[PDB]
Design a binder for this molecule. Structure first.
Ligand code: NA
Ligand code: NA
Ligand code: NA
Ligand code: NA
Lengths: 396, 396, 408
């Protein structure tokens, strides 16, 4: 029972208090063994739905809209995603210079060491979008390859709804219907899973705050302000701005996106949030044609929030090492950060690799409050996707 | 052609004779290379059907019955399963004290050594019931996670058969129908696979008897009598008793369950028997709502037969080591044996670990006649499931 | 736009020229990093369709035809496959004695060494046809186990279309329809993928020719002529012959099979070609009952082209080692090469790796330092030899289907 958009807010506020307090008294362990499992059951239940929903929804949606309309949606959302992600870095740099995170600090070296995994060739990453076995792609995670096949099937069904034959048209009928059955059924499930969300949300930040809340002091606090005040501006100064521009109401969009935003914040999984991010798209009544393609692709490609975190970390490390960056170095961040634990790749691009003993001991502090910084980031990550879909949907 | 509940019995009796004799003359190898493959083809053909049947049947069954009725079935069958499994251990201990398996024996030490795999945390095992990717769960074995998703889908379909919409209700219609198609088709297959059963049943015990039949002498025979006479009592003294109590006829239940019992006995796979265990449930006309949930869950959770084997082995090892067990130690078995090659976990609970050189050399003999003991166990394992379903079904 | 059976031929002829030339100037690297990815995208897009098509098509096809008719098709196509594969070896031996590949050569020893993976027991390979988890079989490759379950399901649907019940018959209706939906949809996709074929075909042989074209000189050329002239005879002297015999027109069959043949040639994947091999079967209007069973089984079992390659290599190695083979040794090849083309895989080159099993049968194992250094040269021009082989491999399947289809 009870209005559930409040139960979540109650759980979230009450969770932060029960969190920060328990952990400060040394119950960092206690929370992990007792409370966290309830927060995990929530995450599990959401991940459960991702594969059926993304696939099933997209076959229907791609079979619903024109193969021309879809491409135009595609090119629009990508142009949108890159520009928002670029804007988010330059806004993070502005925060990292507005604040001075780790400016005066001279930290303890040689404690921790790192070796980043070197990223796979671009050619191989693009070819891998085309899956060599659909049932394989579905079986093990793999959002992007699934997206591809779902559209290739979506378009295939539509061309069968036209055949000069009756029995051909009658089979493509039932298949596209059955797939929709699943898509309908899956959305229905999230409505029930969101019922357990209060308990999950409470439990989930109860853990984040107990484990890493206490570590948010000193220079490791100034970075947190830098990230959050920056993330706030990505919402007000970039989304609210582009929503007004495109004839949408910012306030009633935030009203409708409330669930996807808090799941994304609590869960830290842009991907694990997808069923909720997607339901909220259907809630505000965006075309299944558009949102079933833009949101799963954006769950992977559009990370405005994270792109900001990468900007404000590249400045934390630079300040702690004790050498500032110029116009030619700062712009080298923005490009690499768009093109990109993968912060390890935008750190070599400026000239301070992660293997470097003192760089590595500085990054060790940052990774120490990561789950705190990553809540805010994942929310703005996900919000950025809904904003893009809403804009592309307005222009069809 | 020919009445097939006889061809199986012929194959089973003729198999034991051709088995015990061939192996006693040294053809333990010959049977393995020539006969066994035919027995394997049977097991393969049954495992083949497990995944489609369990999933497809359960979506239909859970979409058929009330979400309230199902939970009441759930709580009833679990309460039944634990109590039957508890009863089976205390009956195995009674047999292990009635007989004296390995009492006087002092066996050869240092021959064989063991190291048991330490079981995964409980928290992680319960969370793992909720699958993170259904298509994944289906792809690789995994009965329990599938069970969960099948019901979550089953309940979802039913809530779509109610929607104020026509096209929504029409898609959930076709999906639930198609899934039923599979479920219907799969049951039909087992009817043909049971046609090959005679050849398989013959071949299968021909191997068990040739390989391990000769080893059933001495103290390793007294344990076999202790297990089988004990298992006999679990059927007559526990199942026949609870069937009469609940207004079912014991004799015509054994008549209907005949196929699932002999498959389970010959095949040693409680899970591999499932398509037959399930068909026999539909044969006696139990609701697809009930049996499609109770039987696959019971295929994993309810092992009365094995729980007895664990009781009478914990006493074989104790007698061979030469120290008896008290009331506080015997009750420590019953609890751990309910809560549990996993015999290695109920052996540490009494205080005689499996790593211990002389414990390990004693367990080596027991594992030497395992396939003999395991035939009877798996039968009672599977029987116990049908009995539970029949009882819960009577009380709806 | 544009007639696409030409765009492929243009790409194929223009590819060989842009290939052989770029590689001879040292751009073997340049082609691999720039051109090949385009040829890969084609291969990827075809493999993509294999699993849905083979399964979906076969459930429909097996639910369409009589369980008696299917068995008779089964026994006919297998009898055909073995006899064609046997004929292909004895034709390869004839070419390996007609030509003398590596007769006078005495090659550099101790350069390269090999150790072949020992093949799994027959019992275990036959039992493995029956899959223990269908969804598992579908998930990871596995053509043969899928074939089995698709038929077992196909037959099951048909027995449900008969039930005294209405709601039972109505569900088996929708399921068999939905599966057909996929099967229909999947064939429709290959029609679009074949649109990208020109670019792929061009890119694909551009690579084969740049990488291995230059190595086709000397004794390594005489073997290539021996293979290709042999493969040509398998088509004219064996397929054209058996097609006429069975009241089919050879020329208009080659016309209809054109796409599957060039995909198979360019792609080197008998399995990867399957969606095209299958579409071409529906194009010439063979019963979905027959081709949906014969072609995927034949994609793995019937490798006439490869069986010839195994015959003409067993003679290249024998001549290079410097000891000829007798009647009792040559017939020991034909039997083992059939029994190893029955088990050879349907993927780029990995058939020319089971040649290691038909080399021990004559008495010259692959571990032997000078045998291994001779096989090293052969594997050096494998992608050239394997193009032709895979084409004749795939063609042989269509020929068999057409023959069995004529006799229903
Ligand atoms: Na995102
Ligand atoms: Na059981
Ligand atoms: Na082939
Ligand atoms: Na083969």
């Amino acid at each position: 029972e009870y209005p559930v958009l409040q139960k979540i807010l109650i759980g979230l506020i009450l969770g932060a208090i029960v969190g920060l307090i328990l952990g400060h008294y040394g119950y960092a362990d206690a929370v992990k063994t007792y409370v966290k499992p309830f927060g995990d059951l929530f995450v599990r239940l959401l991940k459960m739905l991702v594969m059926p929903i993304v696939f099933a929804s997209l076959v229907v949606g791609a079979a619903s809209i024109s193969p021309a309309r879809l491409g135009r949606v595609g090119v629009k959302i990508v142009v949108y995603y890159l520009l928002t992600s670029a804007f988010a870095v330059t806004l993070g740099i502005i925060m990292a210079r507005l604040f001075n995170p780790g400016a005066g600090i001279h930290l303890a070296v040689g404690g921790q060491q790192f070796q980043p995994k070197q990223a796979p060739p671009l050619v191989k990453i693009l070819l891998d979008i085309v899956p060599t076995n659909p049932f394989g792609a579905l079986a093990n995670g793999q959002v992007l390859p699934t997206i591809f096949f779902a559209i290739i099937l979506g378009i295939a069904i539509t061309y069968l709804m036209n055949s000069e034959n009756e029995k051909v048209r009658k089979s493509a009928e039932t298949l596209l219907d059955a797939i929709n059955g699943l898509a309908e059924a899956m959305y229905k499930i999230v409505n029930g899973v969101m019922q357990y969300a209060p308990i999950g949300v409470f439990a989930l930040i109860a853990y984040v705050m107990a484990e890493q809340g206490v570590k948010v002091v000193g220079e490791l606090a100034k970075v947190t302000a830098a990230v959050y005040v920056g993330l706030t501006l990505q919402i007000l100064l970039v989304y609210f701005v582009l929503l007004k521009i495109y004839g949408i109401d910012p306030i009633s969009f935030i009203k409708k996106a409330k669930d996807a935003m808090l799941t994304a914040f609590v869960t830290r999984s842009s991907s694990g949030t997808l069923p909720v991010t997607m339901r909220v798209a259907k809630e505000m009544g965006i075309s299944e044609g558009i949102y079933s393609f833009t949101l799963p692709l954006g769950a992977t490609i559009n990370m405005d929030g994270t792109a900001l975190y990468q900007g404000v970390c590249t400045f934390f490390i630079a300040n702690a090492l004790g050498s500032h960056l110029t116009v030619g170095q700062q712009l080298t961040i923005v490009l690499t950060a768009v093109l990109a634990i993968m912060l390890a790749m935008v750190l070599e691009s400026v000239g301070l690799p992660l293997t470097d003993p003192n760089v590595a001991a500085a990054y060790a502090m940052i990774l120490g409050i990561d789950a705190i910084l990553d809540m805010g980031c994942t929310m703005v990550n996900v919000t950025g996707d809904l904003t893009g879909t809403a804009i592309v949907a307005k222009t069809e």
